[PDB]
Amino acid sequence: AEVGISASTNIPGAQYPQILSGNRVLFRIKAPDAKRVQVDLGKKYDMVREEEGSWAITTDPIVEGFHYYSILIDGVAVCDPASRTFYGMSRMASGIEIPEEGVDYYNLKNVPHGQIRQIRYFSDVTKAWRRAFVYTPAGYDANTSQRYPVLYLQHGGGEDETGWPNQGKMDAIIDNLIAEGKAKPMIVVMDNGYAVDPSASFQNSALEKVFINEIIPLVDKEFRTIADRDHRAMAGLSMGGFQAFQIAMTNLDKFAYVGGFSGGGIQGGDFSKMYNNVWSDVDTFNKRVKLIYLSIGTAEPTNMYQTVNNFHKEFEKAGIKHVYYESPGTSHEWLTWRRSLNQFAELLFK
Amino acid sequence: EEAEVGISASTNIPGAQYPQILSGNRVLFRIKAPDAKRVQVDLGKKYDMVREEEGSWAITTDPIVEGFHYYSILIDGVAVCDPASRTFYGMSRMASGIEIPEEGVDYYNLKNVPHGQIRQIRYFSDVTKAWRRAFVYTPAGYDANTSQRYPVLYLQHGGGEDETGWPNQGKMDAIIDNLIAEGKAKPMIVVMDNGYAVDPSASALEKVFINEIIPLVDKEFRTIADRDHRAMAGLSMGGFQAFQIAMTNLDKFAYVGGFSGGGIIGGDFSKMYNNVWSDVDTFNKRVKLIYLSIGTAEPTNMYQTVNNFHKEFEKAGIKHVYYESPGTSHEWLTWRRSLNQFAELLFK
Ligand SMILES: [Cl-]
């Protein structure tokens, strides 16, 4: 087709890319001297030369949600000049948003809004400056005798602490849930899933030390938190989900809620003994933990699906109580993770 | 002749070796692009890289001036972000940037001092009927000192940039944190918004500031909401906007700053901004501070505009501070220096 709507991820003033009927995407770029121009969106497409040095292609229908993508000039993968950038795939990378019909819980609404703030701290573990983003709920500044539970929320491999604020649209998701009475007012802390102890010789003891010895005490000191395990949760996507289980299950005195979004799991050991025998007494474990949540997209790559799905099945066989969610029609991509946060946050602190 | 090694720039993404800053502040770029026909880097000027053995291209630049520089990689003439570097919103797109340090200069670096916070606030504008976003710096101790109220600086970016400019390119939180911690600047709130506003039914930006941003900040934050505790400043375009908005709303502002911008004009300088300073002597008692800055190395047209604005102020007897930033051009180090100076003068 030809008439379309500019993607919401376009830089201001950029009319292309445009989403056509059927969620095909029309890409254009001016590159008169280029030898090859491709777009990598689900798969690689060669653009075709058009008039006055421009190239264009119309993709197959693109599945609804958020997708990283690249323009390739002569095989060199780069950010599209026409789109915003995100930290993903271990660099700055383009992303494109394909709207869902009749879904708007991750969109901005005229409801009371929280705030995402940037906090900087020097880590003694890593001997480096670090940065976290902290969501506070609407009315935080005025309700000075109110305190709040805290969710610690982590990004995936190749991403960083800007992931949930940007790709994850987390402030809209949480703003809307709280405004509709579906989630309790809560603080959300988004840090970086990488940590290097320079003196040291998906498990990372440095990251665990950073969380337990630095981030949690800092957040509990700078914010009006309810600083106990019944009001503290940890969750993450992919790598961050493995980290959430590793850190929470070896520090159950600090957390009663844990979530893995397309992450978590593992001959594979003696499942009975995972995380230093944390659930070797299943009955006691089930009453220590208020929530274990696992999610996966139905369309994820087979080995990713199997890892989380087999984790789910081991919980069933052992009788470990948990919530299990398959996101219909999505893969190892951010819409799976927005859906997961939406469900998980509704379950927290109840 | 032989190859060299250097220090990876602080703007590199984690693990990325290049660019490296060599001795003399020459910069070494090296990129894998085996199937490309031409690879260039645009940093001050364009350089052609030389294809090496395994499809790697490399070039060493001339000495690069200290400070922050936008740059691009060009593959077959297509200007893109360098995959090796972080990105910034500038030149009306996402673009690479590179930082070249100044030895012994660190007022814009992170120090072990009490730190403020930059927070994101959203609001829906009646003028533009679109969701907008501002970044608001609150000084160290803001949450704990609930009885304290604060003066406010409205701080604007340049043409082709956006509200992320001062937090990122500007390193503004380090600059203000450090001034406050050293007792050189009073504790203050800094508001950074977007310098573009379009009325869909069609100044729109002036109404956004006067009717939306300032009332929103005064309601959401513990501000001292009067002109003696409200300032406005900006760089390039943002400096022109600061003068236009503040000079037509002097009831709202007592301090105004233009960093490489501000000099609207062969006419009657005495009549500018609807005769705001026609009576020079009452103007000088109404305004606490006029600040103008420029880099000595800025393009001639840009230097003359600000310098001539300053000289018109001098002829008319209008009190103001004028600073020429030595050796810097129309680039962010000039504006980091300006904010450092300007914030010291505010609310005193
Ligand atoms: Cl991962």
Numbering used by the authors:
A (entry chain A): 294 to 494, 506 to 570, 573 to 656
B (entry chain B): 292 to 493, 509 to 571, 574 to 656
Manuscript excerpt for this entry:
To assess the role of each catalytic domain of the multicatalytic DmCE1B, the separate domains were also produced: DmCE1B_nt (45.3 kDa), comprising the N-terminal CE1 domain and the CBM48 domain, and DmCE1B_ct (43.3 kDa) comprising the CBM48 domain and the C-terminal CE1 domain.
The interaction in the dimer masks 10% of accessible surface, as determined by PISA, but with only a few key interactions suggesting the interaction might be biologically relevant. Two stretches of residues in the α/β-hydrolase domain (residues 493–508 and 572–574) were unable to be modeled in both protomers likely owing to flexibility in these regions. A chloride ion was observed in the active site of the protein coordinating with the hydroxyl of the catalytic serine and the main chain amides of Gly450 and Met543, which likely comprise the oxyanion hole. No inhibition of DmCE1B_ct-mediated hydrolysis of 4-MU-Ac was observed in chloride concentrations up to 100 mM, indicating that the presence of the ion is likely an artifact of crystallization. In DmCE1B_ct, the positioning of the CBM48 domain relative to the CE1 domain is stabilized by hydrogen bonds through several residues: the main chain amide of Ser383 to the main chain carbonyl of Gly451, the hydroxyl of Tyr361 with an oxygen of the carboxylate of Glu452, the Nδ of His360 with both Oε1 and Oε2 of the carboxylate from Glu639, and a salt bridge between Glu390 and Arg644.
